[PDB]
Amino acid sequence: ELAYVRDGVIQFEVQQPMIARDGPHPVDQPVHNYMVKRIHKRSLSAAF
């Protein structure tokens, strides 16, 4: 059943590590990212 579903979605997640450095630099924070993605549709045909 693929012709009925419309606007399917997929989503990911990634967290980046961080480094502890001090001095004349602003303090850092952890990282958490969030992303999604949609679908596309294509068909094939033949004759007889």
């Binding site: 990911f12 990634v14 980046q16």
Partner: protein, 79 residues
């Protein structure tokens, strides 16, 4: 901008990408790129719709003989 389902949506994952690299560089690949600094808001608000039921009518019927008008004529069948 799809964002249909909840973005964190904490559930059982089906693997792991390693990729050991920044993703912020490649920005024009994903449909929505949401980047929180660290534990921001909009991660705990559970908004949802709700359906509170449905209703319908009955639509009773009526016969010609139960009507008081039937005493104005003598009806019969004729194939």
């Amino acid at each position: 901008i799809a964002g249909l389902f909840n973005i964190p949506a904490g559930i059982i994952p089906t693997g792991n990408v390693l990729s050991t690299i920044e993703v912020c560089a490649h920005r024009c690949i994903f449909d929505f790129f949401k980047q929180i600094r660290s534990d921001d808001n909009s991660l705990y608000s559970a908004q949802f719709d709700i359906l509170l039921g449905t209703y319908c009518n009955t639509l009773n019927f009526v016969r010609f003989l139960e009507l008081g008008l039937s005493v104005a004529c003598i009806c019969t069948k004729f194939p």
